[PDB]
Design a protein around this nucleic acid. Sequence first.
DNA 1: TATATCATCGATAGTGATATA
DNA 2: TATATCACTATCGATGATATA
Lengths: 262, 260, 260, 263
Amino acid sequence: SKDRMVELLQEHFELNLYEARAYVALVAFGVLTPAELASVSEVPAPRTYDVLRSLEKKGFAMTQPGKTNKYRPVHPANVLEKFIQDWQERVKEELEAKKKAKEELLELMAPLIETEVPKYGVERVWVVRGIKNSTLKTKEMLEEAQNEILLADDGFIAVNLEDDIIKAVDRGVKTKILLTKNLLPRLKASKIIDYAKEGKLELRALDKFDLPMLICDEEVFFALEDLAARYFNYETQVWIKDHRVVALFKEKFNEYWEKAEK
Amino acid sequence: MSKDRMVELLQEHFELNLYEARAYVALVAFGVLTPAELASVSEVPAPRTYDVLRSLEKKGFAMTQPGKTNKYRPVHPANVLEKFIQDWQERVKEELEAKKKAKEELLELMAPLIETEKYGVERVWVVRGIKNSTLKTKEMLEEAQNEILLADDGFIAVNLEDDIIKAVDRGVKTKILLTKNLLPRLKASKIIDYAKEGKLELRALDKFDLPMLICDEEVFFALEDLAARYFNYETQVWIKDHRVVALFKEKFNEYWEKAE
Amino acid sequence: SKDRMVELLQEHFELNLYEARAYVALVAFGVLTPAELASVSEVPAPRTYDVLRSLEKKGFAMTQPGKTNKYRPVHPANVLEKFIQDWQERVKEELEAKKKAKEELLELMAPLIETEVPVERVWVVRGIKNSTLKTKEMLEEAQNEILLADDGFIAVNLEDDIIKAVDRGVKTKILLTKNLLPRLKASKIIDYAKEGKLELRALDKFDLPMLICDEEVFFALEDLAARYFNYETQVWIKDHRVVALFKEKFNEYWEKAEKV
Amino acid sequence: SKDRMVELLQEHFELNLYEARAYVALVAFGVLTPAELASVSEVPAPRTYDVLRSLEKKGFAMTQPGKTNKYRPVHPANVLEKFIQDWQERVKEELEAKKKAKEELLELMAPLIETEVPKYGVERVWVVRGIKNSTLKTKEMLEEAQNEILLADDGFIAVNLEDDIIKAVDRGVKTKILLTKNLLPRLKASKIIDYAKEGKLELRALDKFDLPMLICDEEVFFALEDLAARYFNYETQVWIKDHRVVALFKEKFNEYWEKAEKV
DNA sequence: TATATCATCGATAGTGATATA
DNA sequence: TATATCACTATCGATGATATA
C-alpha cells in the first residue's frame, strides 16, 4: 500500500514521485540522511539531496543543516491538514481573480457587443456585375428590408421585381417607386400599379434622373455608369452598407421624388 | 490595450489560448463569423481558424450556427464567463472533498508506520517558512507538562487556541504575551474566557523584537532575513536545552514586565 | 520574490520563467549555488545549473571567481539599463536594414512597374491607417479640383502632395475639424492659405469625411467592431454622378465652415 | 530577381513566404484574382484566397469584394515607406514600455537588494559535531569577525585557537576572552596571556558559567550540553547567524563578564 | 558519496503544404 | 474553383533519470 500512499500524495498534495516516496520513507524510518534515504527508498541517490530539501520547503520535513543533513518528517496529521487549509486560501484568491477578470471583460466588451446578426456576412461593400448576381443581390436587399424601400429605376435593373417589392410591402415596408416615363409603356400591371392605386405604395414617374438607385434600410445599390456595358448588362454595380453613405443617396432620391409623378 | 487586454484576460483566467482568445473577441465583435471571415479580420492564421472555432464550442464559448457553410456565433460573455467560473468552483469543490478523503485514507495507511513520532533523541530541528511554524509548535504544545511561555507576533501559534486551552486543562501554567494588533482576533476566542476566569495570564505589548514559544525545556523561534521571507524560506529554530531555554525565558520575563 | 518582478522580467527583458526567478533569487541573496538556488526557489534542482549558466550568457549574472560554481547577480541598474541600450542598438541596426531593403526593392520592382494606371472604377482599402495608400495616388493625379474634408486620417502627412498639386494649378478647398488646427502651426498649407493660393476652413464636426479629386471620391464606412480590429472599410469610386453627389454634400459643409 | 524581392520582404516587412510571393506577383501583373495568382506564382491554389486577404489587411493590396475578388497592389513606394513609419512608432511604444518596466523593477528590488557577500553560504543555522568540523567552523567565525569577539570557554571549544584569535586581534577586532579558572593552568606562558598583558585584549577568568559560547559579530556558536558526548568530543553544537538571537547571548556573556576576575 | 546535468512528454505558436464536394 | 484541414519546427515548462571526481 506504499504505492497507494505515494499515489494519494502525488494526486492531492502537490508532491512529485520522488518527493512522495521520500516523505513516505521518512514517516516509516523516522530520521534519514540523503544517502540513507537512497538505501530504503526508490529515490535515486543523486536526487535524494534536492528531494529532501524540496520537502523541507513544502513543510513536509524538518532538517538539521550540516555536513551531514538529517531530515525528520512532519507528522502527516499536521502537514496534510495544513496543506488543505493553505490550498483553500489559494483557491479563494484565484476565485477572486477570475471574478475580477470577468467584470473587466464585461465592461470592455460592452461597447463591442453586437446584437444585430450579420445576415449574409460582415462585408459592407460588394461589387456586382452579372445579371444573375445583380438579381440575387437585389432580392436579398428587398428580402431584408424592414423600414423603407426607395427605388429609382431608369432600367438599369436587370430584372422586374414586382413580386419582391410587393412581398416586401405586405410585410409592412414603406415603399417609394420612381420610374422613367418610357418604362411605364412596358410597366403595365402586373401589379404595383394596383398597389399604387390602392395606396399601398407610392409610384411617381420622371423623364430624367442621372443616378438610379435601390435603397433598402441602411443599404444602397447603384451602378458605375457605363452605357455600353449596361446594354450587355455587364455594367459594374456597387452595394454599400452604411447609414452615413445611404443617408446621402437618400437625400438625392428625395430631390427626384419631389419633382415628378404620374 | 483594449482588444488585446481582452485577449489577455481571456488567456489568463479562462483557459483560452491565443488563437481561441482572439477568435472569441471577433465573434462577440461581429456577432457571426465564417472561418474565412475570421482569418480575414483577425490575426488567427487561416489554416487554424477551423480547429480554433471547433475548440471554442467545445469550451462553450461558441455555438455552431444553424444550417451549413460553417457559421459560428459567440455565446454571450455574461453566460459563458459566468458559467466557466461556476464549473470551476464546482471542480474545486470536488477536489476539496477528494483531498479530505485522501488525508483520511493516508492517515489510515500511515498509522502502522508511526510507532513513535518520543520524537527522537535529537535536540534541534529547523523549519523553513513562517507558514510552517505551527507544524512544530503544535507538537510542543501537546507535549507540554509544566510551563508554557508564548510571545506571539501572529505566526508562532496561529490557530492553536485549542491546543493551548487543552494544555491548560492538563494543568500547564500558561503565560500569553501578544502584540496589541492581535487583540481583535481574541474576541470570540475561548482564551479570554480563561484569562478573566484566571486560568491563564494574558498581557499585551505594542511590539517585541524576539517572538518565541517556550514549552517546558524546549524553545522555538524564527530568525529574521528579508530576502528569506520574500521566498517563504525564513529559518525557524527549535531547541531542547535547559541552559538555552533559561536564556530565552529571561528575555520573555523582561517583556512580560512591560505588558498590559 | 514578488511575482510581479518575475512577470516584468519575462515581458520586457526576454528571460524565461526559471531565469526570471533565478535572477530575483540572486539579487535577493547576493550569491547562490545551483544547489542553494533550487532550495530557495521554484526552479527545479536539475535545471538550476543550465539556468544560471544561461543568466551569465544573457548578462544578468556573473560567475564568481570560484571555482565551485557560485553565481552573483549583475546589479539591476546595470543589467536592466544595458539590455535596453543593446535593444535600442539592434533596432537602429534594423531600421537601416529596412531603409536599405526598401531602396533595393524599389530598384528591383522598377522594371515590373509599368502596369500602373488608376480600368477599374472602384477599390476597397482596409484600415483607416491605410487610407493614404490610395489618397496619395488621388492627389498626385489631380488636375483640376481637390475637395478635402479631413477628420485626421483621410490625408495624414500628405501636406507636400497637396502643396505640389496646388503648384500645378489645381483648385484646392480644405475643410478641417477645429481639433486639427494646432497641427498646422508653421505648416506650409497656412503659408499658401494666407497667400490666397488655397481656401482653408474649419468646422466643429461633419459626419462624412471625404476626399474628392477630379471625378474621383474617397470615403470611409463606419463600424465600431471593424475599427477594433483595424479592419474599417474605405471605398474609392471613379464616377462623375457619384462624385457630383459627394461634392454636393461637401458644398453643404463648406457653407457652414469657419474661414480660418 | 524574384527570390531577392521575396527575400527582402520576409526579412524586413513582416511578410511570410506566400504573402511575399503574392505581393511580388501583384506588382508584376497588376490586377489578379486568387485563381489567377495561383497560375503565375508559387502560392498553392488552396491558399491564394487567405493569402490575398491577408495582404489586404497589411496594406499591401486593394480589393474588389465579390463572388470573384479582384486584387490590385499598393505601390511599393507607398506601402514600404508607410510600413517603416508605422514600425518606428511601434518600436517607440515598446521602448517606453521597457523603460517603464525598468523603473518598476528598480523600485521593487530596492528593498531586496543585498550588499553583503555571504562568503560561505546563505545558511544562518548550522549543526556541527566532531573536532574537525567544530574546528573548521570556529576558524571561519574568527576569520570573518570584524567588530567584536566574545569567548566564554570552559573547554568545550576543543582545539586551542590562540593563533586564530591573535590573528583576529591584529586585524583590529575587539576581543573579550572569558575562561574557567582550571583552564588557566594550561595557558602559560603562551600565547594569549602575552596579548592580555600588553592590553591588546581583555582576559577574565571565572569559576563557573553554565552557558559557554563563541560570539563573532552577528554569529553565535554553542553546544547542546551532553557531558558524556563532550568526553567523546561528539557533543552537538549549533551555529546561528541572527542579530536578535546573538544579541540575547551577548547579554548573557556580559553578565558573566561583570563577574569574572581580570587576568 | 554528493557534487553536477540529461531525456521525455505535451502544448503553444509560427509557418509552409495538403485534402474534400 | 473554393471550401476545408494537416504537418513540421522550435521553445517552453513539468517531470522523471544519469553523469563526474
